[PDB]
Design a protein around this nucleic acid. Structure first.
Lengths: 271, 94, 46
RNA sequence: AGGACCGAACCGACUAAUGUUGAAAAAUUAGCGGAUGACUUGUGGCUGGGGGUGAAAGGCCAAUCAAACCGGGAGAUAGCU
RNA sequence: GCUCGCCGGAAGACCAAGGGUUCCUGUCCAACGUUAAUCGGGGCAGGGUGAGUCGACCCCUAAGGCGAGGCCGAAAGGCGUAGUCGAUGGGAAACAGGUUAAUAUUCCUGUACUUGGUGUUACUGCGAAGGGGGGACGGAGAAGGCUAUGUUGGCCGGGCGACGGUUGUCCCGGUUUAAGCGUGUAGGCUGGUUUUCCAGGCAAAUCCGGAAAAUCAAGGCUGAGGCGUGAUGACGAGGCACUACGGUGCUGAAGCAACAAAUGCCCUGCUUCCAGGAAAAGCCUCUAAGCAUCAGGUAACAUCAAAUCGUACCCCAAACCGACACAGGUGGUCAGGUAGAGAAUACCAAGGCGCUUGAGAGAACUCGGGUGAAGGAACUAGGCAAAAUGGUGCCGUAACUUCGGGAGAAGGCACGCUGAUAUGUAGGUGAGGUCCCUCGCGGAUGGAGCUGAAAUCAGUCGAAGAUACCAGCUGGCUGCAACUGUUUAUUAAAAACACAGCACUGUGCAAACACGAAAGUGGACGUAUACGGUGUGACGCCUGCCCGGUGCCGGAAGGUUAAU
C-alpha cells in the first residue's frame, strides 16, 4: 500500500512510503542469519573499483534458498519478512520434517499457504518444478541458468519471465529486459511473479534516504578538472565533447558486450 | 622444589630506610632487595630456608633506575626488584 | 590547532618497528643500511 | 514522526576590530550557522605518487601538492646572471 | 597569620592516550625561570610504586595483517585455504574504616567472594575438532517505580552576641555507614507437565525443530530498590592533654522522619518505525567413535595454588601535541546551594588559584569599554561597526501557498512585595485507626504531617517590577539556488559541488565496468522494480525545427585493403 507523507518539513514533503501490513514485526530467524560486512566498493587491493558506494545502515545476510532442492516435502509459510540484502521481500517457510528455510515471496503468497518443489508438484504460485513440465506461456520467477545451481534470473521486487517456446532439450524464455534467451529444460523455476511489485513506486524524498542504503553522492563529470575526467575544464559550463566514462570509453550508445562464449543462447537481443 | 643454589642467589641485600624500619617494627614485614627475575615462591622459600623464619606472604615491586648525569654524560642506574616479606606472628629477625 | 604528530606507541611500533621492518625485503634493506652506517638505535622501538 | 523550530556541550568559521619581528608559521574578543543527523568523536586498520582520495576547490596526501618526501643518476643542463 | 579578589559543568577531582621519576625529604643559586630568589617542574644525594578480586598477561573473535600446502607472476613478489594474530568489543571474583612526607579497592583491622588442581565419603553413563540454546546487539518516544543527591522538621553538642534587639517561630555544626548473605517486591517475558511418532540439524542423539494425545490455569526465567544481617563494630561535632606549633595520643552524644528528584538504575525492558540493526569463546544440554565397573562426571569437606608486568607524578596541562614554564589542540568519568525551563547565566560550598617583572605619573596617540546637548544614516561602496529588540501567559495577525507553512508575522496588555479567598488553595505524597485476604516488601477506606504552582479582589514603594547577567530588530519589492547539507586546513561558504526526482545509454551473470602483465578481487553472496556511466536537478506548465558536419547503432551487395 503506497501512502503519501504530509509536507510537515522539507525532505519529507515529497516522500511516498510503501507500507506492507503482512510483514513480521520482529527479529529474523537466528539459525539462518550470518554476517554481511560492507566493503566501500573496494576490492582486495584496497582501491575503489566502483565509485559512489560506502556508508549506510549495517545489514546481516539472510541465507535464502535459491537452489530449492527439498523435493516432495510440502512446506507451509510461517511468515513474510523484510530483507535488506535485496529489493524483494522474503518468506520464512517451514517444511513438514521441521526444517525452516527462507524463500523469495511470490505475488499472492500469504501466511498459511502450502508450497512444494519437485517434478510432481502441483501447478500453483510458489511451487518449484523443472521447466519441461511447466506449461508454455506461463510467467515464472527465481529461474536457474544451469541445472541445480540456483535461481539467478528474475530475482528483484516485481520481475518475471515468460516461457515462450520449447524445442527439444532447450526452452526459449522472454527475459524481463525484453531479450529472448535459450536455457536448458532441466533447470528448476518457481511459478508466478515475485511479490513486492510496488517497490518501484516509492520515492526517497531526501539525500539521506539514499545515504542510508550505502550510496555515496554522484559527481557529474563536467564539474571536475581535466586531470580528473575527460569532460573537465572550462571557464563556465562547457561540454564540447562526446560523452565518455572517466576512463575514455563512450557511453551514449556504444555496446560493450564481448562474451562470445554465451552468444549461442541469445536468440534475439533486447529492444 | 626450587634448588638450594638458586635460593642462595635470589636474595641480594636488606633494604634500609625509614619506611622499611617502620614496616619491620609495626607490620612484622622486612624489606629485601631481590633479583629482578625472582618469583614470590622463590623469595618465600629462600627466606624460610636460609634465615629459618616462617613467611606469611611476599609482596614484590620493580624499582625503575633513575636517569642521572655524571658531569656532562647522561647515564641510567640499573633497575632492581624490591620484596616486602611479611614474617609470621611472633617471629624475630636481625 | 591539531598538530601532525599525535603519538601512539602501538601505532609507532606497528608502523616503524623492528618486526615491521623485518617482515618485508625493503625493511631489511633499511636495517642493513643503518647497520652499515653504524646507528646506535636501529629502529623506533625502545 | 521529522537531514522540523529556539538554544548549551560538541563540530564549524559568516562579519568587524586587534594582532602581521603576534600569546599563535591563521589565533583572541564581541556577534554567527548546525546542534537526532548526509551529525560529531575516541581506538585500531585499509587505499602510495602519474598513484591514492575528493558532496569537485586541482582541494588534501605529516606547517611542503597542476604530481609528496628521502636516497641515487648528479658536480643534469643553463647561448643566462 | 588576618583581610581582598578569580574559577566553581572548572581555572575543582579521577583515569585512558602520551610523557618517564617531573612525585616526597634534606641541601645549593654558578647555568635554566623573560626581574630579585632563601623558592621551583632547576643542580646534587637519599627515599617512594606492595594486588587471587583494579589494568595488562591469559581464553575468544570484527575490520585488517601474516599465511603450511596451493594458484599466479621475468626474479623480487601478488592473492589466498587450513590455521594464527589483531580491542576499540565478549569472558571468574572486594568492600568500608585507619595509616605514610611520598603507595593504597595493593599495607593493617573487620567482613566476603571466584576459578583450578589434588585427597576422603556418598551418588552414577562419561566423552568432541560435531548439533542446538545462550552470549546476541538498531534509531526515536512515553510513563511508572527507585537511587545517588538536596531541602525542611526532630534529636545531639556548643552560643546569648565589639552597635539598637536576640531564652526564641533564634544561630552554627553533625545527623554517615559498603561489598557480601537472606528475603524476591514495583515491574518485564513466556501457558507449564507427561506419553507416542518423524524425509530436518552431513552420522547419532534422551537435546533443538515438526506433528498428534492427555492433564493443570499456574508453573518457570529476568529484575532496580527497600528491609533484616554484615554493625554491641567503624566513623562522628567536639572535649581532655602533650608538641619539634607540623601534628600525635585518649574519650565520644545524636546518628531518625517527611518532601523534591535525576541525563544514573529497573531498561539488553515497553510502544512504535524502516534505513531492518557484528563474530567467536567462556556457560547449559545432546550424543559418534572410544572407555565398561576403570577412567571420568556433581555434592560436601579438608588442603594447596592464583604466577609475571604496571601502580610515584601531570593528564583540558608549566610535565602530552605545538622549537618556549606558548592566550592554541586533547577522549571518558563525578555533577552540590540559591534564582532559572536548563549542564545557559550570576553569586557561593567542597576544592583550587591571583595567570614569575614591579613602582610611579595620569601628555599626544593606540587597544577594550561607559555616557552625551540639538539632529537621526546627512557617514560610507554598503547601516560596515556600534546602538536597538530580546522572557512567560493572553488578545490579535496580511499577501502568497505545494494547505504543511508564512508566524514569535506585524501590534499590544499583565508581571515586584503584602493580606484575604486559603493563618498554604487546586494538585502531588502519604502515617496512625478500621476491615478483608489465598498472609506479605499485600489490598480497600481513611486523612494526620510534608510539599505546592496558578488565578481573583484589595492595599503599598520607585521614573522604571521579564528591574541585574542571560535573551529574535521588524516590514515591503526583486535576481539566483527548491530545501538541510558540502567546499578552496592558511585572503573566496557562494549563484559553485551534492541532493531526491527526470531522461538516455551499457549490462542476461564466469554481466558491463574497475584495480590487477596474471591469479583473483570489488560490483554482489546483488540479477533489468538491479548495478555502472553521462547530462539535468523538488514541485506547476512544458521540452518545439534540423542527421548537412563529428560521434554512436544497424546492413554487407559492390570498390579499395595487411600478415599468409
Amino acid at each position: 500500500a503506497v501512502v503519501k507523507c504530509k509536507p510537515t518539513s522539507p525532505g519529507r514533503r515529497h516522500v511516498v512510503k510503501v507500507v506492507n501490513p503482512e510483514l513480521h514485526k520482529g527479529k529474523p530467524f537466528a539459525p539462518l542469519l550470518e554476517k554481511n560486512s560492507k566493503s566501500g566498493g573496494r576490492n582486495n587491493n584496497g582501491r575503489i573499483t566502483t565509485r559512489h558506494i560506502g556508508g549506510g545502515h549495517k545489514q546481516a545476510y539472510r541465507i535464502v534458498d535459491f537452489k530449492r532442492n527439498k523435493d516432495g516435502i510440502p512446506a507451509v509459510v510461517e511468515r513474510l519478512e523484510y530483507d535488506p540484502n535485496r529489493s524483494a521481500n522474503i518468506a520464512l517457510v517451514l517444511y513438514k520434517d521441521g526444517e525452516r528455510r527462507y524463500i523469495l515471496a511470490p505475488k499472492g503468497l500469504k501466511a498459511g499457504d502450502q508450497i512444494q518443489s519437485g517434478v510432481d508438484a502441483a501447478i500453483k504460485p510458489g511451487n518449484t518444478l523443472p521447466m519441461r513440465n511447466i506449461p508454455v506461456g506461463s510467467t515464472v520467477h527465481n529461474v536457474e541458468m544451469k541445472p541445480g545451481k540456483g535461481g539467478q534470473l528474475a530475482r528483484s521486487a516485481g520481475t518475471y519471465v515468460q516461457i515462450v517456446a520449447r524445442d527439444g532439450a532447450y526452452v526459449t524464455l522472454r527475459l524481463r529486459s525484453g531479450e529472448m534467451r535459450k536455457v536448458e529444460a532441466d533447470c528448476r523455476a518457481t511459478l508466478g511473479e515475485v511479490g513486492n511489485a510496488e517497490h518501484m513506486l516509492r520515492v526517497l524524498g531526501k539525500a539521506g534516504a539514499a545515504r542510508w542504503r550505502g550510496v555515496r553522492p554522484t559527481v557529474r563529470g563536467t564539474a571536475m578538472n581535466p586531470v580528473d575526467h575527460p569532460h573537465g575544464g572550462g571557464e563556465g559550463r562547457n561540454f564540447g565533447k562526446h560523452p565518455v566514462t572517466p576512463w575514455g570509453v563512450q557511453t551514449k550508445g556504444k555496446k560493450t558486450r564481448s562474451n562470445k562464449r554465451t552468444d549461442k543462447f541469445i536468440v534475439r537481443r533486447r529492444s | 622444589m626450587i634448588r638450594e643454589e638458586r635460593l642462595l642467589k635470589v636474595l641480594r641485600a636488606p633494604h634500609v630506610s625509614e619506611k622499611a624500619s617502620t614496616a619491620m617494627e609495626k607490620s612484622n614485614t622486612i624489606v629485601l632487595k631481590v633479583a629482578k627475575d625472582a618469583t614470590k615462591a622463590e623469595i618465600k622459600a629462600a627466606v624460610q630456608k636460609l634465615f629459618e623464619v616462617e613467611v606469611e606472604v611476599v609482596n614484590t615491586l620493580v624499582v625503575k633506575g633513575k636517569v642521572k648525569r655524571h658531569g656532562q654524560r647522561i647515564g641510567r642506574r640499573s633497575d632492581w626488584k624490591k620484596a616486602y616479606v611479611t614474617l609470621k606472628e611472633g617471629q624475630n629477625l636481625d | 590547532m591539531k598538530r601532525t604528530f599525535q603519538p601512539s606507541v602501538l601505532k609507532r611500533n606497528r608502523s616503524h618497528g623492528f618486526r615491521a621492518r623485518m617482515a618485508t625485503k625493503n625493511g631489511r634493506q633499511v636495517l642493513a643500511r643503518r647497520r652499515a652506517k653504524g646507528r646506535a638505535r636501529l629502529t623506533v622501538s625502545k
